[PDB]
Amino acid sequence: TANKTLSRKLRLAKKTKTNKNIPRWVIAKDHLKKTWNYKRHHWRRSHLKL
């Protein structure tokens, strides 16, 4: 909606910011083979209830 409360805006803002890949130097640093962050989401198939 274009008319949203600041409290809903802030919780939506955090899901946008943390929706990221693992950095590549972290993959070298921590010696990882699983490289996908499975807590990511995509707007077409998500149901963020926030």
Binding site: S7, R8, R11, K49, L50
Partner: protein
Amino acid sequence: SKGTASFGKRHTRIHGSCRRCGKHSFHLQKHECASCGYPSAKMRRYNWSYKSLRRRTQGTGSMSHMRKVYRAYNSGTLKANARKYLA
């Protein structure tokens, strides 16, 4: 038309975010939480669901204060501090 067509009439929010437990369970029209019971002063807890009890309880969070008090008692100096005071 009680099936697929009826589902296209949904553009409402029944529940929102609770200020106490954080879940998508606060009824916006009754002003009550269906998870923790807010604005009641006590927490909603039922013995007919022990799985619901283990999901949110003591220990599933930080325990930030209780952790420090126990380690001071078990191996720190707190049991000495009571003897000076309780005299």
